[PDB]
Amino acid sequence: KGKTSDAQIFGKFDTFVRRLQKLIEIFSNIQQFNALLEGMD
Amino acid sequence: SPNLCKSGPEIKQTEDKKAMEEFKNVKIEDYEREKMENL
Numbered sequence A: 001k002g003k004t005s006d007a008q009i010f011g012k013f014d015t016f017v018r019r020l021q022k023l024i025e026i027f028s029n030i031q032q033f034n035a036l037l038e039g040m041d
Numbered sequence B: 001s002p003n004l005c006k007s008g009p010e011i012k013q014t015e016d017k018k019a020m021e022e023f024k025n026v027k028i029e030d031y032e033r034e035k036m037e038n039l
Helices: A006-035 B023-038
Strands: none
Touching: A006 B023
């Protein structure tokens, strides 16, 4: 907004944040089945 | 019917005499915990 290499790093940071969320989701799927149901487990 | 019984998972396994008045005490606790995770 002030002024009328850094983007590829922000993209590699967004990809790193995306991969970390995918591992978190597979985790939460395993815990939800434990809470449930033999077929669900 | 004999389909229902006690120490069912494996027949004459571990050879526990105590189990018949304790493994019963344990299995309802193990089942009781399961309902506490559900709610």
